Amino acid sequence: KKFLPFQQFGRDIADTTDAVRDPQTLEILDITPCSFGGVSVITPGTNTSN
Amino acid sequence: AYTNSFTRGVYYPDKVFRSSVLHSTQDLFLPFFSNVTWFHNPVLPFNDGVYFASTEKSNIIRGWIFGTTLDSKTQSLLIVNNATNVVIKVCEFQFCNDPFNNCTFEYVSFKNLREFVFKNYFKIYSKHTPINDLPQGFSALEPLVDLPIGINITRFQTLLAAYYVGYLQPRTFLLKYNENGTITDAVDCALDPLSETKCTLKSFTVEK
Amino acid sequence: GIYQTSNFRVQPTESIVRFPNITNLCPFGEVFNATRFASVYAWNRKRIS
Ligand SMILES: *[C@@H]1O[C@H](CO)[C@@H](O)[C@H](O)[C@H]1NC(C)=O
Numbered sequence: 060k061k062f063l064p065f066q067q068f069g070r071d072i073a074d075t076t077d078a079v080r081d082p083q084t085l086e087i088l089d090i091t092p093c094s095f096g097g098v099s100v101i102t103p104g105t106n107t108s109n
Numbered sequence: 110a111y112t113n114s115f116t117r118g119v120y121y122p123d124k125v126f127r128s129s130v131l132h133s134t135q136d137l138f139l140p141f142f143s144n145v146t147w148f149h150n151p152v153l154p155f156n157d158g159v160y161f162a163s164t165e166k167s168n169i170i171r172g173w174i175f176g177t178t179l180d181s182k183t184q185s186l187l188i189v190n191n192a193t194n195v196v197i198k199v200c201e202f203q204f205c206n207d208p209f210n211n212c213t214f215e216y217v218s219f220k221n222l223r224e225f226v227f228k229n230y231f232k233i234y235s236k237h238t239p240i241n242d243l244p245q246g247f248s249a250l251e252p253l254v255d256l257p258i259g260i261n262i263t264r265f266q267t268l269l270a271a272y273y274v275g276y277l278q279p280r281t282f283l284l285k286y287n288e289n290g291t292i293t294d295a296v297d298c299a300l301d302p303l304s305e306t307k308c309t310l311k312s313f314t315v316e317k
Numbered sequence: 318g319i320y321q322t323s324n325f326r327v328q329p330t331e332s333i334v335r336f337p338n339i340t341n342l343c344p345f346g347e348v349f350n351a352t353r354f355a356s357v358y359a360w361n362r363k364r365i366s
């Protein structure tokens with residue numbers, strides 16, 4: 060990303076803060092949310108196997 | 110004397126990058142197509158805030174003064190340029206009736222259009238472009254300066270070129286950022302029924 | 318069947334803090350390390366700002 064020299068935070072669509080500008084070496088950093096999601100358990104019937 | 114503001118008097122209301130997006134805001138912006146008082150010495154109200162723009166060839170305008178009375182009675186903000194340095198301070202100055210103590214802040218650093226927004230504590234935004242009567246066009250004024258001073262401003266003056274002034278009003282605006290974080294167009298959402306529509310839809314293109 | 322029964326979530330390792338390269342410090346050598354100190358009938362009074 061290429062932000063203008065005064066810009067500190069980045070924003071995406073629904074006000075999702077998407078980037079920041081590091082104030083100690085002038086890098087724009089893309090933020091990924093820490094990974095999460097549903098867990099599913101796939102089973103034959105317990106009458107068949109555990 | 111007066112002139113049309115057109116599409117000018119727009120700035121970034123926050124230090125935030127946004128791209129290819131039609132961000133809506135309510136803030137102190139210049140109403141589109143409003144009269145702008147025109148000058149070429151006098152004293153003016155600061156209002157809620159000021160848009161100021163000057164077209165120059167010979168660098169006539171050097172700065173501004175702000176406060177309540179602008180002659181000894183209290184700390185009054187000053188900006189002044191002389192040679193290769195810009196000098197900015199807030200002291201209780203015995204300023205002249207017609208120019209051309211106690212510091213809480215001191216700092217030392219037609220063919221040109223220079224543009225400035227002054228607003229409440231205090232902020233300066235600007236732009237410049239070369240030119241060839243304020244021009245029909247658009248760009249947004251980038252922030253230059255934050256002054257944490259808290260000075261109680263209500264009136265202001267120029268230090269000396271055609272130049273124009275208008276006063277900011279708290280209106281809703283739709284601001285179109287490009288791929289590169291830059292505001293490249295805007296809608297004044299209370300200008301006309303089509304602008305009320307572009308802001309209802311959050312869209313710069315309106316279908317039938 | 319397939320049953321949805323929990324939510325996964327990677328937790329943080331530690332906490333970063335970021336602010337400007339620290340600069341424009343007040344010259345305390347003008348109050349605590351100066352070459353002279355004032356009286357007790359009229360003191361040096363300084364607006365640090
Ligand atoms: C901060 O300090 C480093 C050296 O430690 C320097 O290389 C860097 O450019 C500085 N960044 C800013 C924005 O001051």
Ligand SMILES: *[C@@H]1O[C@H](CO)[C@@H](O)[C@H](O)[C@H]1NC(C)=O
Pocket residue numbers: 287288289
């Ligand atoms: C974006 O930035 C590049 C320079 O890196 C510039 O050439 C290009 O014209 C810019 N795009 C827009 C839409 O202004």
